[PDB]
Write a protein that binds this ligand. Structure first.
Ligand SMILES: [Cl-]
Length: 94
């Protein structure tokens, strides 16, 4: 039944938490609700697909040019994380 490995599952969980904290920080700075910056669904997708570029984040459902620019800090988190830990990035099907 499971398609992903145990290690991939843990990586997604760990990265997701870092994205939640980065979203909170950036939303607090912009004085906006966290969900206005990115919904939980967007964050789940970002933890799974791991976009590291602006062009790649835009391929995620619900991420426009404007949101992509707002998500720059989180793209930095994903690239830092996936470097320190040795995991695959930019996992897109199409
Ligand atoms: Cl976490």
């Amino acid at each position: 039944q499971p398609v992903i490995s145990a290690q991939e599952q843990e990586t997604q969980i760990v990265l997701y938490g870092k994205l939640v904290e980065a979203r909170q920080k950036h939303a607090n700075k912009m004085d906006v609700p966290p969900a206005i910056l990115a919904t939980n669904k967007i964050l789940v997708d970002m933890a799974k697909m791991r976009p590291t570029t602006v062009e790649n984040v835009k391929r995620i459902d619900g991420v426009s040019e404007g949101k992509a620019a707002m998500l720059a800090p989180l793209l930095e988190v994903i690239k830092h994380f996936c470097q320190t830990n040795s995991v695959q990035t930019d996992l897109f099907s199409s």
